[PDB]
Structures are given as structure tokens and as C-alpha cells.
Amino acid sequence: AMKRLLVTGAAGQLGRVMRERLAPMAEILRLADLSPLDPAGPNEECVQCDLADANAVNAMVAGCDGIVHLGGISVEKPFEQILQGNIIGLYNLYEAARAHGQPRIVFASSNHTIGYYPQTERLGPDVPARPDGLYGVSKCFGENLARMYFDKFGQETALVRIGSCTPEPNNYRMLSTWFSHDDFVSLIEAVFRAPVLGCPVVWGASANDAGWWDNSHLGFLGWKPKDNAEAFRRHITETTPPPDPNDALVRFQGGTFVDNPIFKQ
Amino acid sequence: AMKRLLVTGAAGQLGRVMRERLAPMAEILRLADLSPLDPAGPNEECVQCDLADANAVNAMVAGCDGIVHLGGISVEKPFEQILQGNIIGLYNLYEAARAHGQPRIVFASSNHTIGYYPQTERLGPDVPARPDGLYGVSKCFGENLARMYFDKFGQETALVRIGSCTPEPNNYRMLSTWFSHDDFVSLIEAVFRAPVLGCPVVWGASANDAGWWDNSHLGFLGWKPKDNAEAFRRHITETTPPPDPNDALVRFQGGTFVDNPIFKQ
Amino acid sequence: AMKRLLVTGAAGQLGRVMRERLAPMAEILRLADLSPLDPAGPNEECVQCDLADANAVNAMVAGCDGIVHLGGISVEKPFEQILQGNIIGLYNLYEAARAHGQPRIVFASSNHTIGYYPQTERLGPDVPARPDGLYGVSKCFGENLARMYFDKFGQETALVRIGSCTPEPNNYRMLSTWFSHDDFVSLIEAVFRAPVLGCPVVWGASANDAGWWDNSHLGFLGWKPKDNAEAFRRHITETTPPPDPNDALVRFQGGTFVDNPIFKQ
Amino acid sequence: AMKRLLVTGAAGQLGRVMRERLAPMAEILRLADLSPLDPAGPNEECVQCDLADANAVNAMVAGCDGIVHLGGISVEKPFEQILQGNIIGLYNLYEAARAHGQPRIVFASSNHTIGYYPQTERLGPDVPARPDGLYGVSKCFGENLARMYFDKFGQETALVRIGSCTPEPNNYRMLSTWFSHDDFVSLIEAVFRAPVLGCPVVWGASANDAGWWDNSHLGFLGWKPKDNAEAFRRHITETTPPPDPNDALVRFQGGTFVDNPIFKQ
Amino acid sequence: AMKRLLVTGAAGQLGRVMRERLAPMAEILRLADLSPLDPAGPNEECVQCDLADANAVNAMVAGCDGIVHLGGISVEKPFEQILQGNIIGLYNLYEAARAHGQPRIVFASSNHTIGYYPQTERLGPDVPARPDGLYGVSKCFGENLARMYFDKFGQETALVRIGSCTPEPNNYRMLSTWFSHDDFVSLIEAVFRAPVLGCPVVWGASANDAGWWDNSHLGFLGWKPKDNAEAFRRHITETTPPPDPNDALVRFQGGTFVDNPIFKQ
Amino acid sequence: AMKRLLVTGAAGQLGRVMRERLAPMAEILRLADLSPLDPAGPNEECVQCDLADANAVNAMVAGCDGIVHLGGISVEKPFEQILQGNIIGLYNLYEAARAHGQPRIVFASSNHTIGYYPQTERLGPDVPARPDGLYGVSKCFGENLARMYFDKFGQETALVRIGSCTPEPNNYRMLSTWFSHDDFVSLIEAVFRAPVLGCPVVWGASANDAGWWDNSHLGFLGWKPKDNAEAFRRHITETTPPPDPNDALVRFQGGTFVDNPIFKQ
Numbered sequence A, B, C, D, E, F: 001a002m003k004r005l006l007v008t009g010a011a012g013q014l015g016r017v018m019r020e021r022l023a024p025m026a027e028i029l030r031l032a033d034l035s036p037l038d039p040a041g042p043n044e045e046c047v048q049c050d051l052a053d054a055n056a057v058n059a060m061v062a063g064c065d066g067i068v069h070l071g072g073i074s075v076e077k078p079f080e081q082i083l084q085g086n087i088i089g090l091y092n093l094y095e096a097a098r099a100h101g102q103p104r105i106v107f108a109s110s111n112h113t114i115g116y117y118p119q120t121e122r123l124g125p126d127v128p129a130r131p132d133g134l135y136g137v138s139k140c141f142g143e144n145l146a147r148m149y150f151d152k153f154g155q156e157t158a159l160v161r162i163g164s165c166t167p168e169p170n171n172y173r174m175l176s177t178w179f180s181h182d183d184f185v186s187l188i189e190a191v192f193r194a195p196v197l198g199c200p201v202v203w204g205a206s207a208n209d210a211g212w213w214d215n216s217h218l219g220f221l222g223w224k225p226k227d228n229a230e231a232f233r234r235h236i237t238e239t240t241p242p243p244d245p246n247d248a249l250v251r252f253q254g255g256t257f258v259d260n261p262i263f264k265q
């Protein structure tokens, strides 16, 4: 398909998955991370750079026809680290894209943007943010920044609020939040194939019977996830303690992130 | 089941399909069009007449237990043609029905009633009209008139906003708008079998993954389309040039109709 | 405010009021009607013609900087008459405007576009039309046509759904529908001063305690009606017979129009 | 799932089904009814008593881990009888639950809480009640009371507005209201397994093509009905007389209950 | 105007006010209460009776052209008292009205029907009930019953959810809930004068700046309260201790009723 | 009232106004800014500190019972400066408050959080953000951060999206966006007096006839602005050129901010 697809955060959990899974989407896959990467194989380029380094980011993006942006701080951490990877880093990514043809972006946002909602409430894409920590707040920043770039310059971005992207559901919450590898891959393919995308909020979950999120307004994209966490309900009962009804795990959409304090360095 | 079903526009694309598919629905199928009709077979009656001719429309409707109204100007044309076929014609149709037992009507409205909406916007049945030309405006007229006859006299009509009712999806837009022959046929069956219909807006599309329209409020009818344009995405990608993101074809729900000028004779 | 303002339907009830009240809005007031006009005074031009005649409408509009479109059939009548003044006439008006610099239009639409709603239901501008006769259907046509010209060519129109524009309220329904001369004049002023108008639905009523309609989304125009029909309640109670609860007058927003039959020539 | 499950109304139509179908859900099934119960088998306890008698209800509930509350007056009857089983009985049940560890409750509410809505209107869980008789009003009382106990004490209840829970659909209305035994059993299972339930309104219907009700906001429970009344349409069409369009059966969601008078003792 | 107006609860706080204020509304005022009533003056009739006594309620209502129903248990009490006065009592009232020409009813419902909502949430008339006790639940019963009689028989009722109808606002909550005597009186006048009423929910509050409730949909009645609790903020600040932010008084719309236990005799 | 009120940005435009206007609200007014302040008068303390300096911010806040946070970058600027004053600075402010009793905060947010909405659209507090530059994005950051602190720790904040806080409206946009000094002062007083605030979005505008924003859901606060920009419409026509309809000034709620590029250092 496209000539060069950039995957940031390529040394991380989802990154290593996409390095393999997204290979067929582009002639060249460019992997990037602040961490060392397994050496480039055929049809790969590998880049080491800090998202906080504007010039390095510019060079990282130059020549790419698309970006799957997975790089950054992925859990609650002290402000200083989140500022670097998720705030400053987002600005640098969007400036870099703006300078190099505005390649379409799949932004790994997070359920933690809305982590304080009760699990009993079904959410559409326009609900007000209720971030469950500094991490969630920084993902909101990425979303607001992407939106401004879309309105101002036409830069297109899929704001994918990922639930739990794992090999399989492994706790009660994931019966709702699970986002299979296959379904995330198919979403990415649907996002790049669209003639027109805009800057939509996308709920990153598989077709789970217990899902909390409404993607119906994204119908124009033609993406229907195929996996269903519900198949794993018995597996969960036979491999974990039953949740305590007072556990954040079953009370808040962000689960135990709500229990995180403000971490300090 | 019913004694006599009138199909107008019977010489056109859809009319020819329905002349065949709807036969099982009535002892007699009365076919009508302004254009020459293939001669009547057994259990058929053929009438060639102009919808703008009130007396002719009266005789066309007399003795009919139902009407599938496909007849009229079907594309953007100069005002006078549309006035005759779609405005005067609709008034004549409704008066004729009113004088002859108010046979239930399936009205072929159009997506062009809402053609100026962006394709990214999901639409429910109550959205304000945004017609994309004189043709669209005239289909709005049909919907408004039918509603008035419903409220005033109890005349029942299904206002079917047809997307693209063709043998197969042919382009990117039809991945959203396609309305299979089978699904239109089952809709008509569902409309006529209903003890109570009212005057509902019905979105005329199959169960397409990329559909833009929400038919959920029509649930009482018990009609669920079974076809899905998504099955053709690959095929369309393989046999047609990728749309330009600036083409009305992938920007507006009415596709290229928004680009139509006002046509003059 | 402007060089020349066209007032159509200038011989009619509202026309005669606006001929006097709108004089200060332009250097020249052009008055037009199908019927004879009192002779042009200083600062006036008068033209007698039929909206159904394109050449005449073209001349009527040429050189005008704005149009207050009051001309047309104003009550339920046979379809033939409505077709001329309200359907053909509207097409002609919009084509003439399009050929002559797209002067901003105040369109006299009508409450009868929604006449079948119960009086107990409060309506915002986006409710589905429920016209109470051919007249109401024809005003819907005007709205649909104007919206199409706005979306296609940028022609701006205020779709004013007039309640009862009279010297004073004189029945129970008018405690809700009354639209004072002063408040209609001020709306017209606010419509023409606006740098940007669009094609908004506007509910044409004064600030009546018993009003049925919500103009809040029109706030950007900065128009606040100042009269209030409520002040006339006692007068009406003493001057008129109490309404029968089964009377259309107190059951439908369109009042007795719902009781109109289809009139024939 | 639990040590002891109480099933009230166990002698009635649904009671007899649940006595068999819910056995696997608990070590001990306690069956209760005003009327005589078939003798307790292994793993059963049986208690015959009136919900109107607090001491008896206290004993009935004590030691139970969950309650499926089917007991009460199930059709329109004189107020006196409804008062006992459905009003006084409900207060007693909730007080007994409050005194005995607040075992989770599945409440058999009813479609008759909203029986006066037209069949053409799709309903979400928050619609205002429109009860079609004293019976419907009494089920509303149950819902209101349960909600109060939830907000005040945390007592959790599933307010199941049952459509028509029968072996199969046997009339036109049931194509929309049918609630299969299997789907009710699976709902009960999903209600009791949930770590958190709250006090949700639940529409009690299978996955019928012609369904009137929207359970989407209940998604967090992970319950998806699997049966579909639509499969019985032909059978019903051939086995029963076509409904008269003026019949309450096809006009109101409560069907013929709207035609019930107020019955007197 | 009307021949005879029944006021129940006439011995209570509000009843005493209305015995005086409503006199001008009818030739005869029939006052009723279970408690001793001051003896009847000219143009008065006094009846001392229990609402739970069906025969008594029948005679109380017979010959009355309207009813202001203030009678019943007015605070949280044990179930039996509320059952008699507010549940059995309401059934009796509605049956009595049904047997005697369906005199229009002003029903004193209560804010306690929705007492568990946060004070920060603005409420429209269709919000789901959240009663804060047995008293609240019983007022819900009244609303549900009245609605059923409306739908089934056409009996009209104003369901007035009274906030705090007192001579003046006394505390912080009353800055939002206050309903002046004058405004309640004008509401009642507006209710009875209306040709068509229906069975509307009415929020019983004056035009308070800090009001929580939206009466806009009641516009057709033409009732606009004129008093405003805000005028008393200073005074309340000056003469009462500032509320603790944790007090139900400033946390829940039902104020301290949420803190009520279930009272036993 | 309170002992010590902090006003940040006290050397700026609004700061100098509030230094004077808010004096009566507290025994001690503490003014802070990165810029030099006019020396402390009686009942004033003056502090010089960079919002980016965590320790200085801690000391700035310690001992204050309330904060009006006006300090930060107030217009579109390069990222580096906005990062310091509006992002890092916001984190430091919220940490400082959290360490010192969580004094209630009035946050100067901005209309520029929603600057890309058309002026024709009326906005409620829950609309999705559409920031019109880096500045707007940073105000969104402050809002999301404040919300997280509220959900996590109970920190209360008024998120005041200020329109144009000036001595008087001085262009066409300000007929909609004007926020008088008096009305901002009264809002601040209303915010601090509330027993319960939460973390509400507040639209910072006076009671302008041409206002675009809906504060109705904030009714519980009891704040009604008293000034009206509409009084200044003639003043505006007589002191400025009429707006060009294509000017951002009359097309976007953020006015010419939409025209700002990304500024670089």
C-alpha cells in the first residue's frame, strides 16, 4: 500500500505487536522509540529518538506517509516524565507532521481520558473528559492538540481511546475493555483506507457483549470489530478471584487508575 | 394476498425489478409509467399515463389496494419537468388515493432530501432536510404532502429515502448507500403487512457496515435488511480508481448531486 | 441600512404595514404585488406583477439589496392557486435573487408548517414539519427550497414562521401566537444588520407568556421581542366566548386550519 | 452462584418455569407463594404465605442470597387485591430484604408500566411511565420503591419490565413483546453474576426484529438475548385472524390492558 | 367563575392559605380535612373526613367543579399512615372524581419525588423519579395514578411538584426551592382557566435565580411566576448559620429527607 | 469574609482590575505575578514568582483561603512560553493548593477552548472542545487537570471560559462575548459563597442579547449577570468599520485567533 509507515513506541508492548502486524500495510516500516530496537530487517528502518527532541522528531517523521503513534508514557507517572513524552512530545509530533505533508495519524489515546465515569454508564464519543490522573490528562492534551491541528491545518487523526489491548481478557474489567490485536489491526487499516477521516474519537474495544462504549457515529468508516471478550467470561472466573464490588476494578471505567495518587520523582 | 397492487414508474430501473419481484404480493399487478410499458402478461394490467394528468392518475389508482410509487423524475432536471412529475404528480396521487379508499403507499423518497449532510454525520429519521437540488426539494415536497394527508385523513405512507438501489455497490459511496433489491422487496412486504404503519421516514439502505443512517425507531415494523455492502469493499477497491478526498462523492451524502447546477431546459 | 428594499405582497395585510414601517430601512422601498398598489410616493417604487411570471420577478428583484417576501397565497386554497404564488413563485424568486447579487431574504413562512402539533408541545426550530394543509405544505416547500439555495449558492434567508401578526391578539390561540408589528419590524432589522445570517428557522412570535416556540438557538442575532400577548388575556376573556376544549382552536398549533378540507377549483 | 435463592410467586406460570430452570443457580431453591406449592424435592424449600403479612415475608426472605420476585397480582384486578400483593407486599419484601443482608432482587415489573405508549414509539429505559391500569400503576410503585431503597440503603434491584414471557409468541403483539424462557433465565444469570448492578430498568424481551425497547444502556451487564420472535411470524399469520388496525392489540404497547375498565370488588 | 371548588388538606398550612386566597375563584369553596376545620363562613362548606374512607371521599367530591388536592400525609411517616392518606386516598379521590364529572385536579405532588438528585443538576419534567422516602414514593404513586386516569378516561391533573411553599425563604436550600403563596395561587388560576391541560408535571417554584427546575415546556399554560427567592439571600446569610457543605441540605434536592430512616409506628 | 484571597497575574489587565474590585472579599489580598507589582498597600501582600517554579508557587498559595487564577500566557504565543505559564504552571498551582487545604479556585479559562465553533451555534457547557491554537489547547489542559483534581481529591474549581472582559464592548464580536467587570466580580462572589461548587464549566459573558452560550445548568449557583452588551450596538456601528462577512471576527467564536499560525520563538 503506502510507501513508508512510521510506528512510534516500537519497542513497547503494542509496538512490538504492530512491528509484526502492520508490516503488510507499507513497503517500508519505520520503527522508532527512545529505547533500543531489534536491528532493522529487510523492509524496515529503525530510529532511536526522544519524542521530546523536536529536530529528531522532524527527521523521524520526514518521508513517512502515515503514523501509528504508540510512543510515550503509558501509565501513571510523575509529571516530569509525562510532560516530556506526552505533552512536549505530542507538540513535536504534530509540528513534524505539519512540516512533512501531514501524514495521517493513528493516535493511541486512552480509556483513562474518561476513567472516572462509572462502569454502569454507556458513553458516546462526545462525553466530557474525566481523566483519572496525570496520564489521562496528557492523553486529553493529545486529543485537544490533534483537534486544533485538524481545524487549523486539516491534519487528520484517529483519536483511539484504547481499552485493554492484550492477547486475551484476563480480568473482569477486560470483559468490557478488551481490544484484541486483530481488531486494533483492522481499525488501523480502516483508518488509513478512508478517503476522509477528520479527527474522530474512536473507542478502542472489540465487539464485547459487556462493552461500555458507543462507536455508532463512526459508522461511515465501515469498521466493525470481530472479537468478543464475552467468550472469556468463564476463563476469567476460573483464573482470578471474584471482584469485590467496592474495588475500583468494577466501579470506575479507569479501574484502579482512580486509586493512583499523584506520583512524585 | 391483496387484490391489486399499483406500481408506478414501472418502466424504469426499479420499476422493472418490482414488476417481477412484487407479483406474489397481489392477485393483480397494475403497472404504470409515462414511458412505454412491456405488454401486460397474465395477472397484469398496464396503464401508460402522466402523473401530472389528474384524471389519468385517478383512473390509475381506482381499484388498487396498495401503491408502490416509484414514478416521477428521478434525477436533477429543470424545474418544469420536476414540477409536473414530482409536485403536481404527488398532489394528484394523494388526491386519487383519497378518493379510492386510501390504499397504503410506499413512497420512493430519496437520500437527496438530505444530500448536503457530511458523510461523517450519522442521521436519525427526524433530521432537518438539506435537499441537494430541485429533485431533492421535490422529494421533500412528497414527504411533507404525505405527512399532511396522514395527519388530516389517516392516509398511511412509508417515506423511503432510497440510497442506491442497484444490483451491486459500484463505488465508494455505495459502501454506505447501497440498498439491495432483496432488502427493498422485504421492506415493501413489511410495510404492507403491518396492521399499523403511520407515516414513517424509512432509510432505504441495506445492513451496510458503513451505513450512515439509523433505522432503529422503525423497529415496530420488524424489518431487518440482510444484505451488506461491506462484502464488496475489496471488489470495489480492485475495479475502480480510489476516490479523491475532495470529490463530493466522498464528502457529501448526496454525492455529486451537490455539484449539480440549476438545470434549464 | 440599504439602497433599495423590495417588499412583495405589498398590497396585502402585512404588506401595507411594512410599506410604512420599513421605509426607514432603505433609501428606496420597492413595493410589489399581484394586485393594485397605492401610487408610489417619494422614496417608493411600485410594480404590479405575478410571482409566477419569471420575467416580471426578475425585473422586480433587479437592483434590490434585500427582500421581505410577503407575497403569495396566505390561507388554505385550491392547489392550483397555491402552485402559482407559493411554489412556482418561490422558484422564480430564488432564481431572480441568484441572478441579481443574492440580496438577503426575509421569507414569510408560517406556523402552519407545524400546525398539526398539539398546543401543549414546545417546539424548537428543528422539529419535523407537520403542515396542516396545502398552504402549510407550500410554505415547507419555500423553506426546503431556500435551504437548498443556501447550501448550494450561499443565498441567505430568514425562514420566519409567523404566528398571528395582527394589531392585537383577539382570541385564545393568539395569546400564544401573537406577533406584534413592532416585534416583526425589529426582527427584520436584526435580520438585515447581521454580518452572517445563514438560513435559520425563526419562530415569528412576540415574547408571549403562553408562547409555544423556542428561539434560543437564534441568540447570535441579538433579537429579543419586547411585546407580550399575556397583557390582553382579560380583554379576550371578556370580549370572546370561552373556547370549547374540543375546538381545533385550542388543540392544534394550526388552530382551525386542521379542520380545512382540500379545497377544489 | 449462591447458597439459597428465593423464588416468590412460585406456584404461578413463570414461577413453575423458574422453579425448574433456576435450580442450577443455587444449592437451595426456596419457593414461595400465596397458593399451594408442589412438595419440596431435594434441594428445595417451600413456604406458603401472603406477601401482605410482614412476619411471613421476613421468614420467607431470611437466609436467602437472592430473590426472584415473581409473586403478586399479575393482571388488572380490583384495587383491594393489588394493594395487598403489589403495594403492601412490595413494602414488606423490601423491609425483609433490608433486615436480612439486602439480597439482590430481580423484580418482575411489567410492560404495563408503559402500556399507553403507541407501538410505533421506540422506548429507552428513562421514558416517563404511562401505566395502563391499576396493575401497571402498582408495578410503577414497585420500581419507585426499589429505587428509593437503592438510593437510601444500597439495595440492588433489576427492574425487569417483562413483555410476554411464554413458551412461544402466539399473536401479533408478541412478535414484539415475546421474552423467551431461555432469555429470561440468562438475564437472571447476568443479573446475579454482576459485581455491581445498581437499580436498572431492564426491558424484558428477546432479540425480536420487531422489538420496541432499547436495552443498550444496560451493556455493562453483558447480557444479550438470543431468541427472536420474528421466526414465528408466518405461524402466527396462518394460525390467527389478522388484527383490526383499530384494535388496542396493535395500537398500544399494553395491548388490550388499555381497554380494561377499573374493576370493582 | 366556577360553581364549587374543593380544597382538601384545608386545615393544614397551605390549606389555610388557599381557603382565603382561592375564594374569588368559585361561588362556593368546599373545605375538607381529617383534622378539625374552622367553621364554614358564607360561601363556604366544610367536610371533615378521611381520604381512606371511599364513601366519604365520594360525597366530598360530589358537586365540585374543581379540586385542589393538598390533603394527605405531608412528611416522612410510617408506611401505614402514608398508605391510607396518600395511596388508598389517591385511588379514592380519582374514583370519586371519575364518578362526578371528572372535575379538574391540582395535585400537590412534591420535590421529594426527585429528592435524591444532586442540587447541581438542572431537571426537566421528564426526569426519572428518585423519591427520597416513603412519602416521596407515595407522591410518585399519585403522579402515576393520575397519568393512568388521564390516558384512560381523560381526567386532567396538574402534577405540581411543590418545592418549599412558605411565606419566605428560611434557609439556603429555599433560595432554590421557594414557591411563594402568590405564585402558587397564580399557577392554580392558570391551571383552571386553561381550555386544555392534559396531565403535566409542573415544578412548584417561584422565579428563583437559583432554581433547579425547568418549567419551559409548560409554556402553553401562560403561567410565569413573579417572585424570586434571590431577593432574600442577604437576609438569609444575616439570620442563619452558613450550611455545612456536607449537609444533605445543600447536597440533595430533597434536603434532609434523604437522611430520614424508614419510620416505624 | 475570608482571611486571605490570592489573585495571580495581578500585574496584568484583569489582575489590576481585581486587585481593586476584590479587596472587599478578604481581610488580606495577596497579589502575585512574574512581573513587578505596585508595592503592597494596607491589607495587601505582594509576591513575585514564576508559576513554573513549584516551590515558589507552594509558598505563594500557602495561607490562602481562595484563589482567582488569572496568571499565565493570555494570547497565542510560541509553545515554550505557554508550556511554562499554562501547563507546568497549572500543575504547580494544583499541587500547591492540594498541599495547603485545597482553597477554592476560580480558573480563568477562555472562549478560545471552543474558538473553532461557528458563531451561529449556541453552546452548552458539555460541548466538545475545539481550541483555536496552542493557547486554547493550554486552557483545555487547565480544565482537564482541574477536573481530575476534583474527581480525585475534591478540589473545587470554577472553569470560567471568559469571553471579552473589557470596560465596554468595542467590536461586533463583543456584542456576544462581552463580560463586564461587574459581572465577572459578581460571578467570583457567587463562586466563593456557594456551599458546594464542584468543577463546573462557566461561560464568562454578561447577559448579552446576542450571547452564544448557555449557563442555565449552573442555575444552582444563583448567579445572573446584569450587564448587556446590546446597549452598545450603536456605539459599535459609530466607532468601527462594519465587519466583512468573511472576517473570522464574525465567523468563528474565537474570532481572529483561528487565523493565528503556530508562532515560533
Ligand SMILES: NC(=O)C1=CN([C@@H]2O[C@H](COP(=O)(O)OP(=O)(O)OC[C@H]3O[C@@H](n4cnc5c(N)ncnc54)[C@H](O)[C@@H]3O)[C@@H](O)[C@H]2O)C=CC1
Binding pocket: A008, A009, A010, A011, A012, A013, A014, A015, A033, A034, A035, A049, A050, A051, A052, A069, A070, A071, A072, A073, A074, A075, A084, A085, A089, A108, A109, A110, A111, A161, A162, A163, A164, A165, A166
Ligand atoms: N496497552 C493497552 O492496552 C493500552 C495502551 N494505551 C497506549 O498506547 C500506547 C502503547 O502502549 P504500551 O505498548 O502498552 O506502552 P509501552 O510503555 O509498552 O510503549 C511505550 C513506548 O514509548 C516509549 N517512550 C516513552 N517515552 C518516550 C519518549 N520521551 N520518546 C520516545 N519514546 C518514548 C517507550 O520507551 C516505549 O517502548 C501508549 O501511548 C499508551 O499510552 C492506551 C490504553 C490502553
Ligand SMILES: NC(=O)C1=CN([C@@H]2O[C@H](COP(=O)(O)OP(=O)(O)OC[C@H]3O[C@@H](n4cnc5c(N)ncnc54)[C@H](O)[C@@H]3O)[C@@H](O)[C@H]2O)C=CC1
Binding pocket: B008, B009, B010, B011, B012, B013, B014, B015, B032, B033, B034, B035, B049, B050, B051, B052, B069, B070, B071, B072, B073, B074, B075, B084, B085, B086, B089, B108, B109, B110, B111, B161, B162, B163, B164, B165, B166
Ligand atoms: N435507484 C436508486 O438508487 C434511487 C431511486 N430513487 C427513486 O425511486 C424511484 C425509481 O427510481 P429509478 O428506477 O432509478 O428511476 P427511473 O428514472 O429509472 O424510474 C422512474 C420512472 O418514472 C417515470 N416518470 C417520470 N416522469 C413521469 C410522469 N410525469 N408521469 C408518469 N411517470 C413518470 C419514468 O418514465 C420512469 O420510468 C424514483 O421516484 C426515484 O426518484 C431515489 C433514490 C435512489
Ligand SMILES: NC(=O)C1=CN([C@@H]2O[C@H](COP(=O)(O)OP(=O)(O)OC[C@H]3O[C@@H](n4cnc5c(N)ncnc54)[C@H](O)[C@@H]3O)[C@@H](O)[C@H]2O)C=CC1
Binding pocket: C008, C009, C010, C011, C012, C013, C014, C015, C033, C034, C035, C049, C050, C051, C052, C069, C070, C071, C072, C073, C074, C075, C084, C085, C086, C089, C108, C109, C110, C111, C161, C162, C163, C164, C165, C166
Ligand atoms: N398575517 C399573519 O399573521 C400571518 C401571515 N403569514 C404570511 O406572510 C405573508 C403576508 O400575509 P398576509 O398579509 O396576511 O396575506 P395577504 O393575503 O393580506 O398578502 C398576500 C399578498 O400576496 C399577493 N399575492 C397572492 N398571490 C400572488 C402571486 N401569484 N404573485 C404576486 N403576489 C401574489 C396578494 O395579492 C396579497 O396582497 C404571506 O406569505 C402569508 O402566508 C404567515 C403566518 C401568519
Ligand SMILES: NC(=O)C1=CN([C@@H]2O[C@H](COP(=O)(O)OP(=O)(O)OC[C@H]3O[C@@H](n4cnc5c(N)ncnc54)[C@H](O)[C@@H]3O)[C@@H](O)[C@H]2O)C=CC1
Binding pocket: D008, D009, D010, D011, D012, D013, D014, D015, D033, D034, D035, D049, D050, D051, D052, D069, D070, D071, D072, D073, D074, D075, D084, D085, D086, D089, D108, D109, D110, D111, D161, D162, D163, D164, D165, D166
Ligand atoms: N407472564 C408474562 O409474560 C408477564 C408477567 N409479569 C409478571 O411477572 C410475575 C409472574 O407472572 P405470572 O407467572 O404470569 O403470574 P401468575 O398470576 O401465573 O403468578 C403470580 C403468583 O403470585 C401469587 N400471589 C398473588 N398475590 C400474592 C400475595 N398477596 N402474596 C403471595 N403470593 C401472591 C399467585 O398466587 C401466583 O401464583 C408477576 O409479578 C407478573 O405481574 C409481567 C409482564 C409479563
Ligand SMILES: NC(=O)C1=CN([C@@H]2O[C@H](COP(=O)(O)OP(=O)(O)OC[C@H]3O[C@@H](n4cnc5c(N)ncnc54)[C@H](O)[C@@H]3O)[C@@H](O)[C@H]2O)C=CC1
Binding pocket: E008, E009, E010, E011, E012, E013, E014, E015, E032, E033, E034, E035, E049, E050, E051, E052, E069, E070, E071, E072, E073, E074, E075, E084, E085, E086, E089, E108, E109, E110, E111, E161, E162, E163, E164, E165, E166
Ligand atoms: N408546604 C410545602 O413546602 C410543600 C407541601 N407539599 C404538599 O402539598 C400539601 C399541603 O402541604 P402542607 O400544608 O405543608 O401539609 P399539612 O401536613 O400542613 O397539610 C396536609 C393536610 O392533610 C390532612 N390529612 C393528612 N392525612 C389525611 C387523610 N388520611 N384524610 C384527609 N386529610 C388528611 C392533614 O390533617 C392536613 O391538614 C400536601 O399534600 C403536601 O404533601 C409538597 C412539597 C412541599
Ligand SMILES: NC(=O)C1=CN([C@@H]2O[C@H](COP(=O)(O)OP(=O)(O)OC[C@H]3O[C@@H](n4cnc5c(N)ncnc54)[C@H](O)[C@@H]3O)[C@@H](O)[C@H]2O)C=CC1
Binding pocket: F008, F009, F010, F011, F012, F013, F014, F015, F033, F034, F035, F049, F050, F051, F052, F069, F070, F071, F072, F073, F074, F075, F084, F085, F089, F108, F109, F110, F111, F161, F162, F163, F164, F165, F166
Ligand atoms: N482579557 C479577556 O477578556 C480574557 C482573558 N482570559 C484570561 O484570564 C487571564 C487574565 O487575562 P489578561 O489580564 O487580559 O492577561 P495579561 O497577559 O494582561 O495577565 C496575565 C499575567 O500573568 C502573568 N504571567 C504570564 N506568565 C507567568 C508565569 N510563567 N508566572 C507567573 N505569572 C505569569 C503576566 O506577567 C501577567 O501580568 C489569563 O489567564 C487569560 O488567559 C481568557 C479569555 C478572555
Ligand SMILES: O=C(O)[C@H]1OC(=O)[C@H](O)[C@@H](O)[C@H]1O
Binding pocket: A074, A075, A109, A110, A111, A112, A162, A163, A164, A165, A177, A254, A255
Ligand atoms: O486500562 C488498561 O487496561 C490500560 O490502559 C492504559 O492507557 C495503559 O497504557 C495500560 O497499560 C493499562 O493500564
Ligand SMILES: O=C(O)[C@H]1OC(=O)[C@H](O)[C@@H](O)[C@H]1O
Binding pocket: B074, B075, B110, B111, B112, B162, B163, B164, B165, B177, B254, B255
Ligand atoms: O444516490 C443515488 O445513487 C441516486 O439518487 C437518486 O435519488 C436517483 O434516483 C439515482 O439515479 C441516483 O443517482
Ligand SMILES: O=C(O)[C@H]1OC(=O)[C@H](O)[C@@H](O)[C@H]1O
Binding pocket: C074, C075, C110, C111, C112, C162, C163, C164, C165, C177, C254, C255
Ligand atoms: O395562524 C394565523 O393566525 C394565521 O396564519 C397564516 O399563515 C395566515 O396568513 C393568516 O391569515 C392566519 O390564519
Ligand SMILES: O=C(O)[C@H]1OC(=O)[C@H](O)[C@@H](O)[C@H]1O
Binding pocket: D074, D075, D110, D111, D112, D162, D163, D164, D165, D177, D254, D255
Ligand atoms: O403483556 C402481556 O403479554 C402480559 O403482561 C402482564 O404483566 C401479565 O402478567 C400477563 O399475563 C400478560 O397479560
Ligand SMILES: O=C(O)[C@H]1OC(=O)[C@H](O)[C@@H](O)[C@H]1O
Binding pocket: E074, E075, E110, E111, E112, E162, E163, E164, E165, E177, E254, E255
Ligand atoms: O422540601 C420542603 O420544603 C418540604 O417537602 C414536603 O413535600 C413537605 O410537605 C414539607 O413540609 C417540606 O419539608
Ligand SMILES: O=C(O)[C@H]1OC(=O)[C@H](O)[C@@H](O)[C@H]1O
Binding pocket: F074, F075, F109, F110, F111, F112, F162, F163, F164, F165, F177, F254, F255
Ligand atoms: O476573545 C477575546 O476577546 C480574548 O480572549 C483571550 O483568552 C485573551 O486573553 C484576550 O486578550 C482576548 O483576545
